[PDB]
Amino acid sequence: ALDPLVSCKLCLGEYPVEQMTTIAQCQCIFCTLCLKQYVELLIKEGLETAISCPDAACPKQGHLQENEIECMVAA
Numbered sequence: 001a002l003d004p005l006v007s008c009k010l011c012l013g014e015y016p017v018e019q020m021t022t023i024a025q026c027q028c029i030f031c032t033l034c035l036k037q038y039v040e041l042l043i044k045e046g047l048e049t050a051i052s053c054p055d056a057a058c059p060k061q062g063h064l065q066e067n068e069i070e071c072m073v074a075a
């Protein structure tokens with residue numbers, strides 16, 4: 001009865017699985033907001049960074065795409 005679900009790490013907020021999006025290699029969970037404001041900034045550039053998981057402490061540190069991402073934001 002009642003429990004701190006939690007999920008995202010960039011904001012350690014509280015949200016279900018339908019309110020989040022997977023990375024693309026490590027299979028992590030991050031609310032669009034963060035997972036977005038983070039990449040949305042880089043994805044737009046493309047100069048470098050390769051947009052890596054927002055979890056510097058990720059056991060897989062999976063990277064993200066430049067299109068697939070910008071597609072979920074800058075369609």
Ligand SMILES: [Zn+2]
Pocket residue numbers: 008009010011012013030031033034035
């Ligand atoms: Zn978040």
Ligand SMILES: [Zn+2]
Pocket residue numbers: 023026027028053054055058059060061062
């Ligand atoms: Zn990760």
